Design an enzyme around this catalytic site. Structure first.
Site, PDB file in Angstrom:
ATOM      1  N   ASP A   1       0.871  -1.171   0.000  1.00  0.00           N
ATOM      2  CA  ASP A   1       0.000   0.000   0.000  1.00  0.00           C
ATOM      3  C   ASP A   1       0.909   1.222   0.000  1.00  0.00           C
ATOM      4  OD1 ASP A   1       0.361  -1.369   2.777  1.00  0.00           O
ATOM      5  OD2 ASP A   1      -0.345   0.584   3.492  1.00  0.00           O
TER       6      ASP A   1
ATOM      7  N   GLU B   1      12.193   2.144   8.315  1.00  0.00           N
ATOM      8  CA  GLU B   1      11.314   1.170   7.638  1.00  0.00           C
ATOM      9  C   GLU B   1      11.713   0.875   6.196  1.00  0.00           C
ATOM     10  OE1 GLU B   1       7.155   2.663   7.359  1.00  0.00           O
ATOM     11  OE2 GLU B   1       8.022   4.658   7.505  1.00  0.00           O
TER      12      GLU B   1
HETATM   13  O1  LIG Z   1       3.858   0.828   2.944  1.00  0.00           O
HETATM   14  C1  LIG Z   1       3.138   1.085   4.141  1.00  0.00           C
HETATM   15  C2  LIG Z   1       2.630  -0.183   4.837  1.00  0.00           C
HETATM   16  C3  LIG Z   1       3.756  -1.136   5.239  1.00  0.00           C
HETATM   17  C4  LIG Z   1       3.360  -2.630   5.240  1.00  0.00           C
HETATM   18  O2  LIG Z   1       3.897  -3.398   4.156  1.00  0.00           O
HETATM   19  C5  LIG Z   1       3.913  -3.179   6.562  1.00  0.00           C
HETATM   20  O3  LIG Z   1       3.273  -4.406   6.899  1.00  0.00           O
HETATM   21  C6  LIG Z   1       3.578  -2.073   7.585  1.00  0.00           C
HETATM   22  C7  LIG Z   1       4.358  -1.950   8.899  1.00  0.00           C
HETATM   23  O4  LIG Z   1       5.761  -2.020   8.699  1.00  0.00           O
HETATM   24  N1  LIG Z   1       3.647  -0.924   6.687  1.00  0.00           N
HETATM   25  C8  LIG Z   1       3.226   0.383   7.117  1.00  0.00           C
HETATM   26  C9  LIG Z   1       2.038   0.385   6.134  1.00  0.00           C
HETATM   27  O5  LIG Z   1       0.969  -0.562   6.400  1.00  0.00           O
HETATM   28  C10 LIG Z   1       0.261  -0.444   7.642  1.00  0.00           C
HETATM   29  O6  LIG Z   1      -0.209   0.884   7.895  1.00  0.00           O
HETATM   30  C11 LIG Z   1      -1.273   1.332   7.068  1.00  0.00           C
HETATM   31  C12 LIG Z   1      -1.674   2.763   7.405  1.00  0.00           C
HETATM   32  O7  LIG Z   1      -0.552   3.621   7.354  1.00  0.00           O
HETATM   33  C13 LIG Z   1      -2.466   0.375   7.217  1.00  0.00           C
HETATM   34  O8  LIG Z   1      -3.568   0.755   6.395  1.00  0.00           O
HETATM   35  C14 LIG Z   1      -1.979  -1.016   6.769  1.00  0.00           C
HETATM   36  O9  LIG Z   1      -3.026  -1.936   6.851  1.00  0.00           O
HETATM   37  C15 LIG Z   1      -0.872  -1.461   7.694  1.00  0.00           C
HETATM   38  O10 LIG Z   1      -0.426  -2.733   7.265  1.00  0.00           O
END
Ligand SMILES: OC[C@H]1[C@@H]2[C@@H](O)[C@H](O)[C@@H](CO)N2C[C@@H]1O[C@H]1O[C@H](CO)[C@@H](O)[C@H](O)[C@H]1O
Ligand SMILES: OC[C@H]1[C@@H]2[C@@H](O)[C@H](O)[C@@H](CO)N2C[C@@H]1O[C@H]1O[C@H](CO)[C@@H](O)[C@H](O)[C@H]1O
Lengths: 503, 503
Positions: free
Chosen positions: B277, B461
Site C-alpha cells: 500500500d 522502515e
Molecule cells: O507501505 C506502508 C505499509 C507497510 C506494510 O507493508 C507493513 O506491513 C507495515 C508496517 O511495517 N507498513 C506500514 C504500512 O501498512 C500499515 O499501515 C497502514 C496505514 O498507514 C495500514 O492501512 C496497513 O493496513 C498497515 O499494514
C-alpha cells in the site's frame, strides 16, 4: 479471552459445507444450530485426517463431535384467547450463557421465540409478539425483551436478524424504537430516557457512512439519490451462502450463470434482512428467485420505519429535556417524509411503492408494504385514501390481506397472508379513519386464524388468504396480532375469546 | 457473559469517529484509530450528540475527556549488530489484557512490533523480524510470536493484518507456515506437528468458498480461471474507508466519481492486505491512486506463498504420520506450481508477473514480487536464470533492490527499497545458484542501512536505493533482515558487527 463470534461455515471450514451438502438432516438450519463438542479448529483437523484414513463415516463423525438441537399439552377446551395466553411460557427461552462455539448468542433476559424451528429471538417478529405480551399483562416479559435488544445494540452495534452467529451480518425491519414506545405505555417517559442512547446507536448503524456518501451512490444500508435525498435499503455485510439455507442458496446462484454468485448471495441475504425472503417484490422475473436484486431497491416499508425511528428519537430527546436535539430529529424526519412522498409513491398507479436504483424510477408493483406510510403517519391524507381503495381492490381477500397479488411460489406473495402485515395495514388505515377496510382485514384474518384453531388447535406462521421448510406452529407474531385484533373487533366492555361467527 | 471483540472505531463510535478524523485534531489519522474510549462508546456517542446541541461545544476538549491517546538510551558505542540486538526488548510488547473498547486486540504472549506509529504486531513483518530474533538466539520470542498467530487463527479464523480491530477484515501476505518451519529449524518436527491444525485452518481461510466457485468467477480470496485453475488474490471483507487512513481514503475515492466509492475503498483495503500500500503495480494510471484495482489482479507473490503453504502442509502431514494427507497436499502444490508457470509468467518479457482478471492476460510490469517464485522454489531453473538477468538489468540499484522501476510517488515503487523484498530476492536467487546477484543486493542494501546508522544511529522502515506519514524508526523487518545479511556477507570465522567499508 474476548469472543469474536464466527458463523458456522467460517468456524468449521469445508466440514460445514460437506455436512450441509450431504443433507444428513432434512432442515439446513439443524446443523447451523449444532454445538461443537470441542474447538472447531481441532474438529476440522481431525476431519481432514479421518477422510484420509480407512472407512470414514460422516454421520458417525458428526454425532461424536457435535450436539444437535433437541410437545405442548394444554388443558382441555381453551378458547383461542386462553390458548394464546397459555403459550407464552412454551415460547419463552432463557439463555444467559451458551457453550463456547454455539451459534446461539447469549442474552441477559428471558425472551419469546416464534416457535418450531425458530429457536432464537427474531427482531421484527418480537414487536408484534410483544404487543400480545403487553395486551395480556406480561410487562416483565416486554421489558425483558427491550433490555435484550438494547444489550445487542451495545454488544454488536446493532440488533441482528436474531441471536445467532449466522445472523450477525444483518439486521431486520427496525422496530426497536417502536418497542421502546410500547414499553413507555406502561412505564411512561422513563422508558424513552432509559433507551435513548441505544436508540441513537441503532439509528447510527442504519445511517453508517451517510456523511461521506456522494449523490447517486450507495453504501451499506444507505442510499443518496441524485438530488441528495437520503434513504435506506436492506443490506447484509456478507456475500456467501446463508449457513441456515446453505444448499438452497448454492442451488439458487448456480442456476443463474449470468451473474456472479457473490452478488446473488448478497441479494438473498439482504432479502432475509427485509423479512420478505422471498418475494416477487425483489425479482426482475417474478417466477425466478435467481433474478432478485434486493440491494438495488429502496424499500418503502423500511423507510417508513426509519421516519418512525426519527420521530421517536425526537420524542425521546424531548423527554430527556433536550429540546434543540429533538428539533434536529424532527428536521431529519421531515426530510425523510419528503423523500417518501417523492420517491416512494407511484403517481401513475396511485399507491406507495419501492424505488428502483437501476432504472431510477418508482417501481410499479403494489404490495402490502405500501401500507407502511400510513402505519407511521408519514402519508398525506389524500394518498391514504387512495391506499384504502388500492387495498380494497387488489389486496383484501376473504382470509385477510394478501402480501402481493403475485402467485410466484414464494412465501412473501399471493396467496400468503402474514400477521405483521395484517396489523400494519389495520393500524395504518385506522390512523386515517378508514375503519371499514381496517375492520374487513381484521375480521377476515381472524376468521382465518379461528378456523385453523378450531380444526387444528394451533396457530401457525402464515395463512392462505384465498379462503378462511414445512409450515411452522406457535406462533409468535400470529399470537400477538390475534390478541390485538380480537380486542379491536368486540366491544371493550364485552371482549370475545373466540372470533364471533357472525360479525 | 463473555465480552465480544469491539467493532472498528468508525462503527463503534458512529459519526464522532468521522468528525474527529475530518477535523484532523491529530497529525496522524492512525492516532485516533488507536484512541482508547474511557467509557462505553454507546454512551459517548449519546453525550456527543447532546453536547453538540449546545453553545460553545469544543470537539477537541470532548475528545481529550472521553479518550486516552496511546502512550530508549542504549549503552554508548554500539555497533550496528549490537544496536539491533539491544533493541529487541524495546520493540517488545506484552498486552495480554486490553480494555473492552480498545482497538488494540489482546494477545497471550509477548511480541515484537515494527516501531514508531506501528504499535501492534504485523503479519508479514513478523516473519522477517522473527528471522532476526532466531539469528540472535531469541527462540522464546519466536515461539511467543508463533503461539500468538496460532491463537488469532483460533479466535478469528485467520491472522489479521495486525492485532487491531480495524485490521480484522483482512489478513496479510501469508507467512505463518514459514514461521512454523522457522521454529522447526530449532525444535524439529515437533513444531509442524504442534501447528498443523492451525496451518490447515489458515489454508481454509485463504481457500474459503473454493468448493462452490464456478470457473470464470471469484469470491473473497479465491479465483477460479476458466480452465479451472485455482489461485488466490488479496481481499478485505469491508468496503469503507480505513479508520487508520480515514481522510486520505475518502479524498482518494472522491477524486474518481467514475467508480462507486465502495469499490475504491475495497481496492485500497485489499492493497493494504497485500502489504504493497501503495504501488503502480495495482494502478491503471500511476499518478491516480484512485485507479487502483487490487481485487482484479492475481498476485504472483501471494500465489508463491500459497504454494509454499501447500508444500509445508504436506511436510507437516507427513511429520504427523498421515502420508495420504501429505500426498493430497503435494497434489494441490503441484497444481499451484502449474498455475504459476502458466498464468504468472510473462514469456514475451521473460519474467514472472501478476495476472489481470480484467484483460485475461499476464501483466507486463516487472516488480520485486517477481522473485517470489524463486524464493519458494516453485520456479523452473531456466526461468530463475532469466530472473537473475531481469533483476540485474532493471531492479538492482546502488542502495539495494528497487521495488519497481516506476517512480510514482508511492511507497512500494522506485526509489524505495524494502527489507523484506531484499531478503526474498537474495534467498530466491541463492536457491538457484545466482550467488553474485544475491550478494550484490545484500552488500548494496547493507551499505545503505549502515550509512543511515552511522549518521543517525537508527534503522528505519525503508531506504532510497538510488544511492547509499513520516519515516518510521526501529525497525522490526529491517533489523531482522540486516542480521541475516550481515551473517551472509562476512566469513563465518570473521563475523562483522558493522558492514565493512570495502567489500
Ligand atoms: O507501505 C506502508 C505499509 C507497510 C506494510 O507493508 C507493513 O506491513 C507495515 C508496517 O511495517 N507498513 C506500514 C504500512 O501498512 C500499515 O499501515 C497502514 C496505514 O498507514 C495500514 O492501512 C496497513 O493496513 C498497515 O499494514
Ligand atoms: O419468509 C420466511 C422468513 C420469516 C421472517 O419474515 C420472520 O422474521 C422469520 C421467523 O418468523 N421468518 C422465517 C424466515 O426467516 C428466517 O429464517 C430464514 C431461514 O429459513 C433465515 O434465512 C432468515 O434470516 C430468518 O429471518
Amino acid at each position: 479471552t474476548p469472543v469474536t463470534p464466527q458463523p458456522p461455515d467460517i468456524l468449521l471450514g469445508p466440514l460445514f459445507n460437506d455436512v450441509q451438502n450431504a443433507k444428513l438432516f432434512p432442515d439446513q438450519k439443524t446443523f447451523a444450530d449444532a454445538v461443537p463438542n470441542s474447538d472447531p479448529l481441532m474438529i476440522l483437523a481431525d476431519y481432514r485426517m479421518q477422510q484420509n484414513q480407512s472407512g470414514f463415516d460422516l454421520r458417525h463423525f458428526v454425532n461424536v463431535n457435535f450436539t444437535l438441537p433437541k410437545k405442548y399439552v394444554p388443558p382441555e377446551g381453551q378458547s383461542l384467547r386462553e390458548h394464546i395466553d397459555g403459550l407464552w411460557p412454551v415460547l419463552t427461552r432463557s439463555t444467559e450463557n451458551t457453550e463456547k462455539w454455539d451459534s446461539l448468542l447469549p442474552l441477559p433476559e428471558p425472551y419469546v421465540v416464534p416457535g418450531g424451528r425458530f429457536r432464537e429471538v427474531y427482531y421484527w417478529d418480537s414487536y408484534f409478539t410483544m404487543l400480545g405480551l403487553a395486551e395480556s399483562g406480561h410487562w416483565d416479559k416486554v421489558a425483558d425483551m427491550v433490555a435484550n435488544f438494547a444489550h445487542e445494540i451495545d454488544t454488536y452495534g446493532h440488533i441482528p436478524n436474531g441471536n445467532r452467529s449466522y445472523y450477525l451480518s444483518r439486521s431486520q425491519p427496525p422496530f426497536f424504537a417502536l418497542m421502546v414506545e410500547l414499553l413507555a405505555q406502561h412505564e411512561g417517559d422513563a422508558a424513552l430516557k432509559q433507551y435513548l442512547p441505544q436508540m441513537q446507536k441503532e439509528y447510527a448503524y442504519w445511517m453508517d457512512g451517510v456523511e461521506n456518501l456522494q449523490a447517486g451512490q450507495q453504501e451499506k444500508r444507505v442510499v443518496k439519490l441524485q438530488d441528495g435525498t437520503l434513504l435506506n435499503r436492506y443490506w447484509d455485510d456478507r456475500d456467501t451462502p446463508r449457513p441456515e439455507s446453505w444448499v438452497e442458496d448454492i442451488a439458487t446462484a448456480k442456476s443463474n450463470p449470468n451473474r456472479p454468485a457473490t452478488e446473488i448471495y448478497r441479494d438473498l441475504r439482504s432479502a432475509a434482512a427485509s423479512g420478505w425472503d422471498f418475494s416477487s417484490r425483489w425479482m426482475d422475473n417474478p417466477q425466478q428467485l435467481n433474478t432478485l436484486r434486493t440491494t438495488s431497491i429502496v424499500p418503502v416499508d423500511l423507510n417508513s420505519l426509519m421516519f418512525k425511528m426519527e420521530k421517536i428519537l425526537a420524542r425521546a430527546s424531548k423527554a430527556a429535556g433536550d429540546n434543540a436535539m429533538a428539533n434536529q430529529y424532527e428536521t431529519l424526519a421531515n426530510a425523510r417524509q419528503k423523500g417518501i412522498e417523492k420517491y416512494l409513491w407511484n403517481d401513475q398507479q396511485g399507491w406507495y411503492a419501492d424505488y428502483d436504483l437501476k432504472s431510477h424510477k418508482v417501481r410499479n408493483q403494489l404490495t402490502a408494504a405500501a401500507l407502511f406510510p400510513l402505519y407511521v403517519n408519514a402519508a398525506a391524507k389524500d394518498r391514504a385514501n387512495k391506499m384504502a381503495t388500492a387495498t380494497k381492490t387488489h389486496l383484501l381477500q376473504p382470509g385477510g390481506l394478501n402480501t402481493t397479488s403475485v402467485k410466484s411460489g414464494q412465501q412473501w406473495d399471493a396467496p400468503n397472508g402474514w400477521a405483521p402485515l395484517q396489523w400494519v395495514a389495520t393500524e395504518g388505515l385506522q390512523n386515517y379513519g378508514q375503519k371499514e377496510v381496517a375492520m374487513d382485514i381484521s375480521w377476515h384474518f381472524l376468521t382465518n386464524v379461528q378456523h385453523t384453531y378450531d380444526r387444528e388447535k394451533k396457530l401457525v406462521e402464515k395463512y392462505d388468504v384465498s379462503t378462511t421448510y414445512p409450515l411452522q406452529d406457535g406462533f409468535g407474531w400470529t399470537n400477538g396480532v390475534t390478541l390485538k385484533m380480537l380486542d379491536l373487533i368486540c366491544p371493550k366492555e364485552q371482549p370475545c375469546d373466540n372470533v364471533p361467527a357472525t360479525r
